[PDB]
Amino acid sequence: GSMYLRITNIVESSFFTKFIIYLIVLNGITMGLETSKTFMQSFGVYTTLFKQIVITIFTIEIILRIYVHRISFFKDPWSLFDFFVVAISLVPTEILRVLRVLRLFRLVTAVPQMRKIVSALISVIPGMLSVIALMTLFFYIFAIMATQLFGERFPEWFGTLGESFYTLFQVMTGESWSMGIVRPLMEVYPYAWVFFIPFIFVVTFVMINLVVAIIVDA
Amino acid sequence: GSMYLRITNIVESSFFTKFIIYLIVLNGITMGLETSKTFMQSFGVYTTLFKQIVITIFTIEIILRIYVHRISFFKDPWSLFDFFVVAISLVPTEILRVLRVLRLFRLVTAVPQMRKIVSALISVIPGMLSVIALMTLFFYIFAIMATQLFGERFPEWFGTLGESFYTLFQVMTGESWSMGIVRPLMEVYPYAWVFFIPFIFVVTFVMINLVVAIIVDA
Amino acid sequence: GSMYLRITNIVESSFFTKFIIYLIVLNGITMGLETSKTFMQSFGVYTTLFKQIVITIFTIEIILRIYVHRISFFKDPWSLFDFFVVAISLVPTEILRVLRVLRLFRLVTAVPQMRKIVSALISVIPGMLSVIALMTLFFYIFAIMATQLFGERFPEWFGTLGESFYTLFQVMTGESWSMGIVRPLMEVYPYAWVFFIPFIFVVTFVMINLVVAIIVDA
Amino acid sequence: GSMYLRITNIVESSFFTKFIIYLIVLNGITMGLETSKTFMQSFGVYTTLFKQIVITIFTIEIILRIYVHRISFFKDPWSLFDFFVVAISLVPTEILRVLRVLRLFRLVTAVPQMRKIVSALISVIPGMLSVIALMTLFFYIFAIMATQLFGERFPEWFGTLGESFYTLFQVMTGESWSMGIVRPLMEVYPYAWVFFIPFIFVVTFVMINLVVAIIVDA
Numbered sequence: 066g067s068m069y070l071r072i073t074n075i076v077e078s079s080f081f082t083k084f085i086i087y088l089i090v091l092n093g094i095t096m097g098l099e100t101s102k103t104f105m106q107s108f109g110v111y112t113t114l115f116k117q118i119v120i121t122i123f124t125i126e127i128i129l130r131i132y133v134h135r136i137s138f139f140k141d142p143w144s145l146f147d148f149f150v151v152a153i154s155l156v157p158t159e160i161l162r163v164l165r166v167l168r169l170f171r172l173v174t175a176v177p178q179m180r181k182i183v184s185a186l187i188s189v190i191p192g193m194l195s196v197i198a199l200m201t202l203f204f205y206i207f208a209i210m211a212t213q214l215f216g217e218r219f220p221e222w223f224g225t226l227g228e229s230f231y232t233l234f235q236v237m238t239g240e241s242w243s244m245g246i247v248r249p250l251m252e253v254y255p256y257a258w259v260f261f262i263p264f265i266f267v268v269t270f271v272m273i274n275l276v277v278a279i280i281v282d283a
Numbered sequence: 284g285s286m287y288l289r290i291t292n293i294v295e296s297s298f299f300t301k302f303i304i305y306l307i308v309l310n311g312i313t314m315g316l317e318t319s320k321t322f323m324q325s326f327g328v329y330t331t332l333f334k335q336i337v338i339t340i341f342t343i344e345i346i347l348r349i350y351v352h353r354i355s356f357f358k359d360p361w362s363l364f365d366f367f368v369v370a371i372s373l374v375p376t377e378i379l380r381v382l383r384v385l386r387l388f389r390l391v392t393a394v395p396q397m398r399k400i401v402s403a404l405i406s407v408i409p410g411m412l413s414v415i416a417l418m419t420l421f422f423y424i425f426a427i428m429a430t431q432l433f434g435e436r437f438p439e440w441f442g443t444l445g446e447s448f449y450t451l452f453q454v455m456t457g458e459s460w461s462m463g464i465v466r467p468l469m470e471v472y473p474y475a476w477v478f479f480i481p482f483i484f485v486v487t488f489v490m491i492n493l494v495v496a497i498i499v500d501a
Numbered sequence: 502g503s504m505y506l507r508i509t510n511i512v513e514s515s516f517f518t519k520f521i522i523y524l525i526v527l528n529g530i531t532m533g534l535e536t537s538k539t540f541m542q543s544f545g546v547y548t549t550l551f552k553q554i555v556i557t558i559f560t561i562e563i564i565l566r567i568y569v570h571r572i573s574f575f576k577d578p579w580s581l582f583d584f585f586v587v588a589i590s591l592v593p594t595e596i597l598r599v600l601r602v603l604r605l606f607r608l609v610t611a612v613p614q615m616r617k618i619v620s621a622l623i624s625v626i627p628g629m630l631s632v633i634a635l636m637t638l639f640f641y642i643f644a645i646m647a648t649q650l651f652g653e654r655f656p657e658w659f660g661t662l663g664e665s666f667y668t669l670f671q672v673m674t675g676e677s678w679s680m681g682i683v684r685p686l687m688e689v690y691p692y693a694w695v696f697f698i699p700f701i702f703v704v705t706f707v708m709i710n711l712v713v714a715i716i717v718d719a
Numbered sequence: 720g721s722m723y724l725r726i727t728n729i730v731e732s733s734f735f736t737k738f739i740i741y742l743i744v745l746n747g748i749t750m751g752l753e754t755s756k757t758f759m760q761s762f763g764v765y766t767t768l769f770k771q772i773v774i775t776i777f778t779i780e781i782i783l784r785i786y787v788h789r790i791s792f793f794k795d796p797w798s799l800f801d802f803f804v805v806a807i808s809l810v811p812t813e814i815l816r817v818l819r820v821l822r823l824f825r826l827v828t829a830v831p832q833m834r835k836i837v838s839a840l841i842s843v844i845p846g847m848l849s850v851i852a853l854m855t856l857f858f859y860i861f862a863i864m865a866t867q868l869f870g871e872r873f874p875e876w877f878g879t880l881g882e883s884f885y886t887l888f889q890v891m892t893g894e895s896w897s898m899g900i901v902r903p904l905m906e907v908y909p910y911a912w913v914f915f916i917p918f919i920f921v922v923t924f925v926m927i928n929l930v931v932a933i934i935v936d937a
């Protein structure tokens with residue numbers, strides 16, 4: 066209809082998208098300020114009133130956007146994300162506030178250069194599914210072995226399957242791998258390094274190949 | 284013979300290989316569950332009975348695979364590995380259980396994309412034999428020097444040749460290289476950094492070249 | 502005029518530029534010596550007198566350089582920097598001395614190979630503005646979440662927005678990310694790793710892409 | 720002369736070079752064994768007698784090699800190194816033994832693949848002289864500033880110019896940069912991170928470019 070054309074010439078207009086960008090930035094600063102407990106004592110009413118106005122504007126904006134292109138909305142991942150973050154931040158007023166902080170990625174969603182770069186980073190991922198699965202299998206296997214080997218005398222670190230996964234991820238990142246893990250272990254299990262030095266070697270060699278493999282796809 | 288043809292049309296069939304894959308995954312989950320001591324109190328008989336059934340199936344499968352292509356079996360590295368892991372997990376019921384956890388790499392062996400990627404990672408290795416030998420020689424030489432220099436007043440870290448190898452591998456990875464090693468050393472040996480700063484420099488420069496050399500072979 | 506030509510055949514002469522280089526090097530050594538408190542007790546008058554002579558020479562040199570090409574001087578970034586560092590080191594005799602130490606980058610400014618390489622390093626930067634903005638937004642968002650999640654029971658590290666920024670930069674560099682932060686946190690907040698393991702993953706994946714993206718522009 | 724031809728057909732023969740290689744390997748194992756204090760109690764006379772025989776053989780070998788091609792000997796870097804290490808290990812029987820351990824790099828010198836790879840690693844270095852000089856200047860400048868800023872209240876780490884160089888190299892490698900340095904500093908100097916976060920940023924950005932620049936020369 067004639068009115069459908071007009072609201073789409075508003076929605077797909079550069080200005081309306083720029084306005085939702087401005088609301089996003091003001092809102093994000095607001096969230097930066099809301100951590101300041103003294104600032105909150107000073108301006109809780111002003112900021113919270115502001116929050117309510119910006120969220121209502123956001124909700125009606127998502128509604129109009131759903132109107133213009135319905136099928137396109139729920140098969141487009143950026144609008145899918147915008148829908149999902151606003152819905153998350155729509156519920157009546159614990160961890161939900163922490164997620165509400167994610168509304169600021171809508172600044173990625175709105176800004177075309179930000180879209181270009183995020184889709185670039187995601188387009189890198191398919192190629193390394195093979196190595197992510199290899200590494201996941203590897204971590205699972207060594208985690209079970211480390212749990213059954215050190216989990217009893219070292220419950221804090223290898224006690225269960227999760228704690229072992231975590232200590233193996235920590236060892237892979239390199240963080241206190243020896244003075245923190247392998248050397249305290251060796252006070253009781255002196256050939257513990259047979260388990261970790263090969264583990265280090267494989268992880269790094271794989272992690273280095275993953276980085277190499279990223280490049281060649283250029 | 285006519286029967287030899289039929290069992291090979293089963294063995295090299297997509298379905299039989301997929302079945303051994305399914306047994307592998309169920310088994311791997313089982314090994315994940317067997318760490319849960321309460322779950323083990325609950326279902327030790329069910330899981331262990333399951334273990335026995337899956338291992339017998341695996342053994343007869345390795346037998347049939349050896350039948351179809353004997354010479355091909357012991358010159359193929361993937362089947363060599365499958366033979367070796369099942370043989371490891373075949374002995375009567377300490378560290379053997381920990382190895383038995385390696386049966387899950389048979390999931391790498393069975394899955395063609397997993398084969399492709401592992402053979403890729405191995406095909407990277409020949410080219411860097413030269414640098415691995417250089418680095419091994421380097422580590423040996425500096426390990427002997429560090430043992431003879433700090434091994435007496437620092438027995439925990441450089442006392443023997445092994446402890447020195449380990450502290451040098453730890454220093455190469457970077458982990459607590461200073462606050463943990465070089466700075467405590469300098470409380471007694473104040474020009475210990477003449478030994479380590481050059482050591483750091485050479486190791487990293489070599490480690491960076493090894494990464495570079497990997498790429499160019501593309 | 503005839504005299505303007507002569508002073509420009511001095512200023513743009515290889516020798517005058519080499520002389521200001523020599524003054525820079527002598528001065529830099531002087532600053533190296535001035536840290537030695539015993540050396541300062543010995544030669545405070547000689548070095549400080551030297552400082553005054555070299556700085557006056559520098560000031561009149563910047564004056565003549567401004568004369569030869571005025572518009573060119575304040576639109577050229579290297580001379581802009583030379584102007585700014587000498588002006589910084591021109592004020593009557595706390596933190597100003599620490600900045601005065603930056604006069605030694607004038608050795609970068611004077612030396613053509615140094616110019617070539619610094620302009621190379623700067624020419625790398627435009628291309629990664631997109632990712633620097635993405636990462637800044639990311640750090641802001643996770644910093645607000647970490648402040649509101651751990652800032653109360655962990656004021657030292659996530660108490661305000663700044664301390665959270667710092668602990669997140671520290672976690673990104675990898676330094677004591679677990680034994681130092683995430684594991685002490687988990688003594689009180691046991692699913693704190695839901696916040697950090699994804700955070701680690703995104704940061705590294707982005708940091709690795711930033712390195713990759715640098716290369717391709719070759 | 721006719722005899723000069725024969726000894727050169729021995730010296731440049733594959734067999735004579737292989738023999739000095741064998742002596743090198745036996746000797747290197749000997750040095751590995753000499754760290755074992757119980758093994759030394761057992762076989763000090765056998766090993767030391769062995770040492771004397773192998774070193775005399777080495778000396779006469781260096782003499783003959785100097786004979787065949789004199790000018791070529793002192794302008795060739797590999798033979799220069801062989802001369803220098805044997806001369807080092809030639810003096811009458813403290814730190815000299817530690818250097819004597821370097822005789823094992825003669826295994827690099829003798830082995831052609833080892834020569835190829837070491838000359839490759841050295842051939843990488845000229846191209847990065849520019850950045851090594853930039854980084855050295857950078858380290859000098861920030862070291863002077865850090866000494867004058869934190870050297871008094873933190874003598875252990877920034878007290879002199881050397882301790883500052885070391886703490887800056889440690890911070891560059893990343894090792895305990897925060898929990899170990901910057902955070903203890905901030906207990907007294909709360910805006911110390913203005914000095915280190917920029918320092919980190921520049922170092923890494925430069926260190927990443929140095930790695931990139933290595934590649935392109937392919």
Ligand SMILES: CCCCCCCCCCCCCC(=O)OC[C@H](COP(=O)(O)OCC[N+](C)(C)C)OC(=O)CCCCCCCCCCCCC
Binds near residue numbers: 098103663
């Ligand atoms: C992209 C660049 C981002 C730049 C962000 C830089 C943030 C720096 C934060 C510095 C905070 C430290 C200063 C400070 O002294 O902390 C105190 C304040 C609030 O005081 P507070 O701790 O509430 O005092 C309580 C005292 N009591 C309990 C006894 C009553 O706590 C604060 O000061 C918090 C200050 C809020 C700063 C908000 C900045 C928003 C930047 C927006 C960037 C663009 C967004 C797209």
Ligand SMILES: CCCCCCCCCCCCCC(=O)OC[C@H](COP(=O)(O)OCC[N+](C)(C)C)OC(=O)CCCCCCCCCCCCC
Binds near residue numbers: 143187702
């Ligand atoms: C860094 C801050 C994040 C903020 C998020 C903000 C909201 C983002 C949600 C929507 C994301 C949209 C991304 C996207 O559209 O991906 C497209 C990519 C590359 O597209 P493109 O380069 O156009 O090529 C696609 C082929 N074509 C042209 C024929 C269409 O092609 C693909 O999508 C390939 C499929 C890859 C799926 C990978 C899954 C990502 C993993 C999720 C992260 C897990 C964290 C632990």
Ligand SMILES: CCCCCCCCCCCCCC(=O)OC[C@H](COP(=O)(O)OCC[N+](C)(C)C)OC(=O)CCCCCCCCCCCCC
Binds near residue numbers: 197221225228231702
């Ligand atoms: C770009 C996409 C990335 C790749 C795809 C997704 C990567 C993650 C897939 C990993 C699948 C396994 C996740 C998992 O095993 O979760 C279990 C544990 C549960 O921990 P929990 O028992 O609650 O730990 C508490 C520790 N304690 C005792 C001290 C209180 O939670 C953990 O401990 C998680 C530890 C890190 C998991 C990462 C393991 C390797 C991931 C795959 C390798 C790719 C490169 C890292």
Ligand SMILES: CCCCCCCCCCCCCC(=O)OC[C@H](COP(=O)(O)OCC[N+](C)(C)C)OC(=O)CCCCCCCCCCCCC
Binds near residue numbers: 225308
């Ligand atoms: C590839 C992705 C892998 C995903 C793996 C994620 C694993 C997460 C493990 C989380 C474990 C922590 C939860 C927990 O509360 O621990 C307790 C349980 C067993 O309790 P338990 O510690 O035995 O209680 C004893 C109490 N007592 C001594 C007083 C009687 O200990 C456990 O909960 C162990 C839980 C077993 C989980 C097994 C998951 C198998 C995933 C299969 C993936 C595909 C394989 C190819």
Ligand SMILES: CCCCCCCCCCCCCC(=O)OC[C@H](COP(=O)(O)OCC[N+](C)(C)C)OC(=O)CCCCCCCCCCCCC
Binds near residue numbers: 445446
């Ligand atoms: C992709 C293939 C990888 C390259 C080929 C294989 C690499 C390994 C070859 C190294 C050859 C030497 C192995 C070796 O020296 O083993 C001896 C020691 C024995 O340790 P031990 O005396 O039992 O240590 C206990 C420590 N303590 C006193 C605190 C209880 O055990 C250790 O300490 C091992 C320490 C790490 C050894 C790595 C040394 C450099 C390896 C070559 C360099 C390539 C990049 C790293």
Ligand SMILES: CCCCCCCCCCCCCC(=O)OC[C@H](COP(=O)(O)OCC[N+](C)(C)C)OC(=O)CCCCCCCCCCCCC
Binds near residue numbers: 526530859
């Ligand atoms: C680019 C390569 C740069 C090379 C730089 C190497 C610097 C090495 C610094 C070594 C310092 C440690 C030696 C030492 O024992 O420290 C003491 C001295 C001064 O003694 P001091 O600590 O004042 O004694 C006070 C005793 N008291 C309070 C009881 C009266 O404190 C000092 O020794 C400071 C020594 C000044 C060395 C200046 C070297 C300038 C190199 C110029 C490079 C080219 C510049 C473009």
Ligand SMILES: CCCCCCCCCCCCCC(=O)OC[C@H](COP(=O)(O)OCC[N+](C)(C)C)OC(=O)CCCCCCCCCCCCC
Binds near residue numbers: 636640657924
């Ligand atoms: C090549 C160009 C580089 C990229 C452009 C510039 C990068 C920096 C842009 C970051 C914008 C935000 C800076 C910022 O948030 O400053 C606020 C805080 C204030 O700290 P403050 O509250 O005074 O901290 C004291 C800590 N305490 C409680 C223990 C005493 O100060 C900090 O904590 C700073 C912490 C590091 C900030 C870096 C954050 C990510 C930067 C963007 C990511 C690019 C790769 C890192």
Ligand SMILES: CCCCCCCCCCCCCC(=O)OC[C@H](COP(=O)(O)OCC[N+](C)(C)C)OC(=O)CCCCCCCCCCCCC
Binds near residue numbers: 444744758
């Ligand atoms: C390239 C690959 C290199 C492979 C190197 C692997 C080295 C592993 C070293 C393991 C050392 C730890 C074993 C151990 O229990 O230590 C004790 C022994 C000597 O005993 P010691 O500590 O003297 O006993 C004294 C007892 N006391 C004071 C009360 C009388 O101390 C020793 O055991 C030292 C053992 C010497 C091993 C020498 C191996 C040479 C490998 C040659 C490689 C090729 C060279 C080109």
Ligand SMILES: CCCCCCCCCCCCCC(=O)OC[C@H](COP(=O)(O)OCC[N+](C)(C)C)OC(=O)CCCCCCCCCCCCC
Binds near residue numbers: 484797800838839
């Ligand atoms: C890793 C274990 C080390 C063990 C050492 C054993 C003894 C080694 C001493 C002798 C080294 C000989 C190296 C060498 O010949 O370098 C030649 C390189 C590359 O040669 P090439 O690739 O043939 O190209 C040269 C051009 N051409 C064909 C016309 C001659 O061309 C160049 O030489 C260019 C000049 C570069 C000088 C760089 C100085 C190296 C820094 C020293 C390390 C400092 C440590 C902190």
Ligand SMILES: CCCCCCCCCCCCCC(=O)OC[C@H](COP(=O)(O)OCC[N+](C)(C)C)OC(=O)CCCCCCCCCCCCC
Binds near residue numbers: 469488854881882
């Ligand atoms: C491939 C070739 C590599 C590049 C060319 C050579 C690189 C080294 C050139 C650096 C020139 C300056 C060397 C220097 O400043 O030496 C002075 C100090 C003296 O230390 P000292 O005062 O004896 O320290 C004792 C510490 N204490 C108080 C706790 C007992 O000794 C130190 O602290 C040395 C600390 C590390 C020096 C490295 C500085 C940056 C080097 C250039 C950057 C290239 C990438 C790192």
Ligand SMILES: CCCCCCCCCCCCO[C@@H]1O[C@H](CO)[C@@H](O[C@H]2O[C@H](CO)[C@@H](O)[C@H](O)[C@H]2O)[C@H](O)[C@H]1O
Binds near residue numbers: 270
């Ligand atoms: C959603 C994002 C997708 C996830 C996949 C992206 C990769 C994530 C990897 C896990 C991150 C931890 O990253 C960890 O960084 C350290 C840095 O010391 C690596 O250690 C590194 O050493 C060498 C030497 O520099 C590198 O060339 C190599 O990349 C890596 O092995 C660990 O091997 C790696 O695991």
Ligand SMILES: CCCCCCCCCCCCO[C@@H]1O[C@H](CO)[C@@H](O[C@H]2O[C@H](CO)[C@@H](O)[C@H](O)[C@H]2O)[C@H](O)[C@H]1O
Binds near residue numbers: 456490
């Ligand atoms: C079976 C696998 C084959 C084994 C060979 C594969 C390589 C294994 C190397 C040993 C693993 C430890 O890896 C260790 O990672 C750290 C990460 O801080 C490296 O430190 C790194 O600093 C720079 C800067 O990022 C990197 O460009 C470089 O790759 C490396 O020198 C150590 O130099 C490296 O030794």
Ligand SMILES: CCCCCCCCCCCCO[C@@H]1O[C@H](CO)[C@@H](O[C@H]2O[C@H](CO)[C@@H](O)[C@H](O)[C@H]2O)[C@H](O)[C@H]1O
Binds near residue numbers: 673705712921
């Ligand atoms: C003015 C300069 C411009 C600033 C921009 C330049 C980049 C600066 C980045 C911040 C510096 C800290 O750098 C930090 O180094 C560690 C090394 O363990 C990285 O950890 C790394 O793991 C893998 C494995 O090696 C690398 O391939 C990757 O580059 C990186 O993710 C952190 O992810 C990175 O953030």
Ligand SMILES: CCCCCCCCCCCCO[C@@H]1O[C@H](CO)[C@@H](O[C@H]2O[C@H](CO)[C@@H](O)[C@H](O)[C@H]2O)[C@H](O)[C@H]1O
Binds near residue numbers: 909911913
């Ligand atoms: C390449 C970039 C280099 C930038 C370098 C910046 C690094 C800064 C190093 C840490 C310096 C802090 O050192 C200095 O500490 C003193 C006291 O100790 C503070 O002094 C302050 O004390 C209190 C606190 O507000 C006030 O009442 C007082 O009036 C004020 O002077 C200074 O404000 C700070 O400058």
Ligand SMILES: CCCCCCCCCCCCO[C@@H]1O[C@H](CO)[C@@H](O[C@H]2O[C@H](CO)[C@@H](O)[C@H](O)[C@H]2O)[C@H](O)[C@H]1O
Binds near residue numbers: 483487892893924
């Ligand atoms: C004789 C040899 C010649 C000497 C020159 C060779 C280079 C030596 C550099 C000094 C070695 C210390 O190496 C130190 O490794 C750490 C690894 O966390 C680097 O940290 C790294 O973070 C990122 C992310 O991975 C890397 O892409 C980058 O290479 C580097 O900045 C430090 O920035 C680097 O300085």
Ligand SMILES: [Ca+2]
Binds near residue numbers: 238239240674675
């Ligand atoms: Ca790391």
